[PDB]
Amino acid sequence: MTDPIADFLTRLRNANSAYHDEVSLPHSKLKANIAQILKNEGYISDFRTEDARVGKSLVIQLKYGPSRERSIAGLRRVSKPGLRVYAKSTNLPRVLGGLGVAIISTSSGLLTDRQAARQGVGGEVLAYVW
Amino acid sequence: MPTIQQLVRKGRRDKISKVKTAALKGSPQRRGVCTRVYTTTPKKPNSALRKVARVKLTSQVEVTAYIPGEGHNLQEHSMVLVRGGRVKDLPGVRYKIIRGSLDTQGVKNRKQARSRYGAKKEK
Amino acid sequence: NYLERVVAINRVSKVVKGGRRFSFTALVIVGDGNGMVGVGYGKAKEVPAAIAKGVEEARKSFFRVPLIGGTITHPVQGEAAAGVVLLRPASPGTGVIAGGAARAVLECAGVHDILAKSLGSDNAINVVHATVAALKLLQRPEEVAARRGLPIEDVAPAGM
Amino acid sequence: KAXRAA
Amino acid sequence: MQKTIVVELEDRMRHPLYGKIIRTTKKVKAHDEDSVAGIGDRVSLMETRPLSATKRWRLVEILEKAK
Amino acid sequence: MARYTGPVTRKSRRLRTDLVGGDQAFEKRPYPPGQHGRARIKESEYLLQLQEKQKARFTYGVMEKQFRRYYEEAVRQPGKTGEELLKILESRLDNVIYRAGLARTRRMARQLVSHGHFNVNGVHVNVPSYRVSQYDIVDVRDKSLNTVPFQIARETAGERPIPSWLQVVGERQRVLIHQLPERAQIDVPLTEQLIVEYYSK
Amino acid sequence: GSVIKKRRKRMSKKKHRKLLRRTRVQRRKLG
RNA sequence: CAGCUUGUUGGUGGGGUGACGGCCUACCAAGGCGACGACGGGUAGCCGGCCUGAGAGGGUGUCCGGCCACACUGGGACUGA
RNA sequence: AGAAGCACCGGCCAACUACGUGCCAGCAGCCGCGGUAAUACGUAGGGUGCGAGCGUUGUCCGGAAUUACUGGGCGUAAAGAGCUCGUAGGUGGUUUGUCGCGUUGUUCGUGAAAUCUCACGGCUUAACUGUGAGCGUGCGGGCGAUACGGGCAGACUAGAGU
RNA sequence: CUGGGCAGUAACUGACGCUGAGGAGCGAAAGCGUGGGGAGCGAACAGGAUUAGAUACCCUGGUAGUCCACGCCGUAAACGGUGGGUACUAGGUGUGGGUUUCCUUCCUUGGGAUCCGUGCCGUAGCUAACGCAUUAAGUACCCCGCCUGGGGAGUACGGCC
RNA sequence: UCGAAGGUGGGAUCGGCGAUUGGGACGAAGUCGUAACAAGGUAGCCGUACCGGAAGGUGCGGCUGGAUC
Numbered sequence A: 001m002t003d004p005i006a007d008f009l010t011r012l013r014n015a016n017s018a019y020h021d022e023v024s025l026p027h028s029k030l031k032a033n034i035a036q037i038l039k040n041e042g043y044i045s046d047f048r049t050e051d052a053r054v055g056k057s058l059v060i061q062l063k064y065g066p067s068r069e070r071s072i073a074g075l076r077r078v079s080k081p082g083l084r085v086y087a088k089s090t091n092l093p094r095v096l097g098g099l100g101v102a103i104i105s106t107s108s109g110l111l112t113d114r115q116a117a118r119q120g121v122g123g124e125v126l127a128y129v130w
Numbered sequence B: 001m002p003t004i005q006q007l008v009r010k011g012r013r014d015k016i017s018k019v020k021t022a023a024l025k026g027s028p029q030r031r032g033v034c035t036r037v038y039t040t041t042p043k044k045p046n047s048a049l050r051k052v053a054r055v056k057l058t059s060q061v062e063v064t065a066y067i068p069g070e071g072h073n074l075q076e077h078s079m080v081l082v083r084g085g086r087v088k089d090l091p092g093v094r095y096k097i098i099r100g101s102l103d104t105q106g107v108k109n110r111k112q113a114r115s116r117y118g119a120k121k122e123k
Numbered sequence C: 001n002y003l004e005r006v007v008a009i010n011r012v013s014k015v016v017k018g019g020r021r022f023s024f025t026a027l028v029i030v031g032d033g034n035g036m037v038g039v040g041y042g043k044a045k046e047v048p049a050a051i052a053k054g055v056e057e058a059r060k061s062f063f064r065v066p067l068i069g070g071t072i073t074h075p076v077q078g079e080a081a082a083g084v085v086l087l088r089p090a091s092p093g094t095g096v097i098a099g100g101a102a103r104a105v106l107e108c109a110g111v112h113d114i115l116a117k118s119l120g121s122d123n124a125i126n127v128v129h130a131t132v133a134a135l136k137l138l139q140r141p142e143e144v145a146a147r148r149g150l151p152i153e154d155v156a157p158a159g160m
Numbered sequence D: 001k002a003x004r005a006a
Numbered sequence E: 001m002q003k004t005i006v007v008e009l010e011d012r013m014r015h016p017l018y019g020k021i022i023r024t025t026k027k028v029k030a031h032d033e034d035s036v037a038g039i040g041d042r043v044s045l046m047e048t049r050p051l052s053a054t055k056r057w058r059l060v061e062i063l064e065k066a067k
Numbered sequence F: 001m002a003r004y005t006g007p008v009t010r011k012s013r014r015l016r017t018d019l020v021g022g023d024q025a026f027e028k029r030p031y032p033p034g035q036h037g038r039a040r041i042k043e044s045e046y047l048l049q050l051q052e053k054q055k056a057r058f059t060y061g062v063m064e065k066q067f068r069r070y071y072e073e074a075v076r077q078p079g080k081t082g083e084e085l086l087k088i089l090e091s092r093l094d095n096v097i098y099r100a101g102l103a104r105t106r107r108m109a110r111q112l113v114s115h116g117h118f119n120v121n122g123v124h125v126n127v128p129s130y131r132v133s134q135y136d137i138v139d140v141r142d143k144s145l146n147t148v149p150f151q152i153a154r155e156t157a158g159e160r161p162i163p164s165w166l167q168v169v170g171e172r173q174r175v176l177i178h179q180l181p182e183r184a185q186i187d188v189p190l191t192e193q194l195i196v197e198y199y200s201k
Numbered sequence G: 001g002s003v004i005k006k007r008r009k010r011m012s013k014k015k016h017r018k019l020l021r022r023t024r025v026q027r028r029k030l031g
Numbered sequence H: 001c002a003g004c005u006u007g008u009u010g011g012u013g014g015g016g017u018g019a020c021g022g023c024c025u026a027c028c029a030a031g032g033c034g035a036c037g038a039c040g041g042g043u044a045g046c047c048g049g050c051c052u053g054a055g056a057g058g059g060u061g062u063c064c065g066g067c068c069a070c071a072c073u074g075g076g077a078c079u080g081a
Numbered sequence I: 001a002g003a004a005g006c007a008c009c010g011g012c013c014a015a016c017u018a019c020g021u022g023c024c025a026g027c028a029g030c031c032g033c034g035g036u037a038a039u040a041c042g043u044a045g046g047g048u049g050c051g052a053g054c055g056u057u058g059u060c061c062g063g064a065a066u067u068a069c070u071g072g073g074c075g076u077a078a079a080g081a082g083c084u085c086g087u088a089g090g091u092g093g094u095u096u097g098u099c100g101c102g103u104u105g106u107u108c109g110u111g112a113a114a115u116c117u118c119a120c121g122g123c124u125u126a127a128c129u130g131u132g133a134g135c136g137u138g139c140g141g142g143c144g145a146u147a148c149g150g151g152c153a154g155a156c157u158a159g160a161g162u
Numbered sequence J: 001c002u003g004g005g006c007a008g009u010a011a012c013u014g015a016c017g018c019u020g021a022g023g024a025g026c027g028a029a030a031g032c033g034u035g036g037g038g039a040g041c042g043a044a045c046a047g048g049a050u051u052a053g054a055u056a057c058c059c060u061g062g063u064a065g066u067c068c069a070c071g072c073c074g075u076a077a078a079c080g081g082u083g084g085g086u087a088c089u090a091g092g093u094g095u096g097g098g099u100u101u102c103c104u105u106c107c108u109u110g111g112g113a114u115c116c117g118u119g120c121c122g123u124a125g126c127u128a129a130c131g132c133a134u135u136a137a138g139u140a141c142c143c144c145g146c147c148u149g150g151g152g153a154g155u156a157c158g159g160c161c
Numbered sequence K: 001u002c003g004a005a006g007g008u009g010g011g012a013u014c015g016g017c018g019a020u021u022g023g024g025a026c027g028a029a030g031u032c033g034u035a036a037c038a039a040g041g042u043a044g045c046c047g048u049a050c051c052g053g054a055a056g057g058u059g060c061g062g063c064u065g066g067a068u069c
Helices: A004-018 A029-041 A113-119 B004-009 C047-059 C102-109 C124-136 C141-147 F045-060 F064-076 F081-090 F093-100 F106-114 F151-155 F193-198 G004-021
Strands: A022-026 A057-061 A102-105 A123-128 B030-032 B037-040 B050-057 B061-066 B080-083 B093-097 C003-006 C010-016 C019-025 C028-031 C037-040 C076-079 C084-088 C095-097 C113-119 E004-014 E021-031 E042-047 E057-063
Touching: A004 A022, A004 A029, A004 A123, A029 A057, A102 A113, B030 B050, B050 B080, B050 B093, B061 B080, C003 C102, C019 C047, C028 C047, C028 C102, C037 C047, C037 C102, C037 C124, C076 C124, C084 C124, C095 C102, C095 F193, C102 C113, C102 C124, E004 E042, E021 E042, F045 F064, F045 F081, F045 F193, F064 F081, F081 F093, F081 F193, F093 F106
Parallel strands: B061 B093, C095 C113, E021 E057
Antiparallel strands: A022 A057, A102 A123, B030 B080, B037 B050, B050 B061, B080 B093, C003 C028, C010 C019, C028 C037, C076 C084, C084 C113, E004 E021, E042 E057
């Protein structure tokens, strides 16, 4: 068992595929912060920082509603625990121009592609949201 | 293979494409002694005789070379300039000679493709 | 009314006790030069009859392409059941490059700026199907606005 | 007859 | 080795293409006139003039001693 | 690396259009290039695109090896490569003279230029392919006076409308280019994209 | 059938083993 | 090609060197390298760069330019900055 | 006046009508043609392509995502070790604070010239040369932050185990 | 005599986990060593039948062997033709083990919840198709291992056992 | 002292020749069989041991990429 990001994201991939209501998962720092960023983008619906019994938990609402059409295309994690990928501010991802928001961990923290460009700073490219 | 860590443990290597000639380190063309003219039969679905020779190159190697064009002026001598090419109908054929070069004369009465078969302008 | 493009005909055989039944069929596609592209295959002993059937199938099925001027929004991975075709906007482009009969599809679409390439199977039929898959995977900015609020804010200085 | 096999 | 200590040089570098970060292990000769360290201790080493077979490293600082 | 030097009907009919004409508007013939040309023919992108490339080749009279040099340049430059090709070709000396209508045919225009009848700002040039920029004024050769194809040519200059990007004085035929030679904006009798794609395969 | 893929190897090993049972002795042992 | 290594490994002293330096050298210690490829075999002058390719990369490193070695083969030394 | 030839022409692949020929001769890069009606052989003619070059051979790359980081596979297509254990190595949960090694940002130096890109300019144009900028993907030094990774110090517990 | 595993409990540690080249070990039947045993069966073998022929089928009889003690070789569909681990995602039907609720006797020891294991059908998804499908051949991470046209060939030279 | 070239002697390693010999490949109609594909006429296969000129057969054990059911 490892790579919490993969479960974090692939649980969403199942929920997106199945059109389930919400995804419940163990709480953690990165999970919460990332969830807030995705919400800021508006790819996801709201999410909760619950706390069942043994530790804390998280619940992410599946974003959809115009129709059965979900608002989330899919994703892929690119920095793998063994292939860490970092980029410089001037050769940053241009994945689905603008659209393909990559979440980057910089000296300041988690942020978007455009914000990263405006700051002019590199960092670790965790994953893509399509 | 996958698993980047496996690729670092062991590097990669492609399928080695074989050297297709023994023409003196693969030099384009070579001088042959030009011996042993035979007119052998290709595979079954061909029904023909094709002119070849077991000739000795500067490498001291006996090889089978194709004799293009109709006719010839060779008597198991009259050295030849050998070049590449294949036939597929004549197992063992890997090389060809140039008609009209070094000894051999060009092919007569050919009007088309003067640049080949040792052919020439009407002059 | 619409542009005609034809994929290389093939030949089929239904064997019978007393031999063979040769029959012809050729994939045909059409388009209005604005992405509204129809695809039909057909099949018949007669070449024109199978053709007309294909034309009818196309008329029974069109897809409206999210084009920008004469090109696409984002790169797309046209992974079908069999074929694979990846392609990109090529924002300048100034030309249309794709593989065999993909180009024909693009000509029926009426595009002018594509950089595309076919991988995997070269069986033209599923190559086409992969192209179609890619197109159905395409989406416009204002359709993205349905997925997420605050439109406009993207990376597209041209548009028009 | 032959020479080849046959 | 009498007035010189073998030290493991730990380093780290990426493969030129694949980019995987991997660790590099080298060996050095910590020549010094007074061995003042045990084993497993962290030690700061520094380059100087050759003395014997290469003898570039010197013992400077004792830190983070072994259990 | 040299001039075509032959009958026009063999290519104008092969490409199924009168590229230039000359004294005759067109041969007033059908559309079989040669012996068996009356039969129908199956098409290909290679055939088609090739024919278009030939249309430019013979329209301007430039051989392939040089054309690809111009192609390379157009690819190097930003903007639509086909449009860039045409503009580059328009900087050709023989082109602006032909468009000035100072010769019966383009071939005639090139012969005159090749023999120095039309010099430049200060040089007795003899290059059909010379790139003519803005303010690159043609000087009519003084020796060319007391001959036919400058006075009679002037009198017959109306057959070739002067390109809008330049002004010919006429009195001195000082072909003065003012703007860039955007032939893409005027009188394009053939395609460009098909050629652009063609040289990629 | 897919068996074809196995038969060529069956025969090949057979001729090998047969060839050596023909020489499990000084005919081969000396070398 | 997986065991290579006693001038090897380390120290003292001394010489010697344009010069630190087992470079050399008397004595003493017994180490050192190595599967994060020792020893060995095969192949090869290296690079800016040339060619290809969309590029990542591949091939190549011929002219020109820089660097290194060699001068019938081998060995040694003088003069001398 | 005084100076045009060469290759090809069934398809792949722009590029054909006939004659002669009759599994023979003979052509061929792959499929392949010729067994008396050859658009594939020899010839004429016609046409195509290029052009004082044109064709052939040879060699490298690509095309080949057929060594696959970008960018491929292993149920039967060739490919999962007969199974397990366990060393090196790889990898490693929640988390406080820490070092700032890695990475990132900045700055200095470095990264020669020529060559390459771009823009100008000069040889009558071009090639070429010339100017300038760029490129020079990259190192060290110095300068800030510390996200993430990593190390140290330490904790909780669900992991795993008892 | 002795190993392993599962549920519940959550008493204890507090990341001590997973994989694992090279390496070590276990590893059907056949076979081999030494020695015992040896009913029946039964390669080889013999004879008869069949067949044009039949050193094969068929039948008779019958050696080695099968069996046991201690050793070697270390192969096979040693196959689910599916490496291991980890997390997640329509259901239903059967089954094995155990725990626990409603019906608490409606006796049913049923239904329901939960953890493992097992076999079937099946949604999505995947797949060249066949098919897989909460035991994935789906989504997705780590590690290991193996191929890169068929033959020549998993053979030769070499080396280890 | 050092120390070339050379010599002596024995080993390592690479390569070529080598009667002869085995196997492999290829080749219009060669000669005796006809095992495999259907239940291919005794179902086939993997490994293993014995036998025959050959396809092969045979025995222990294993699988279904296997009859009937």
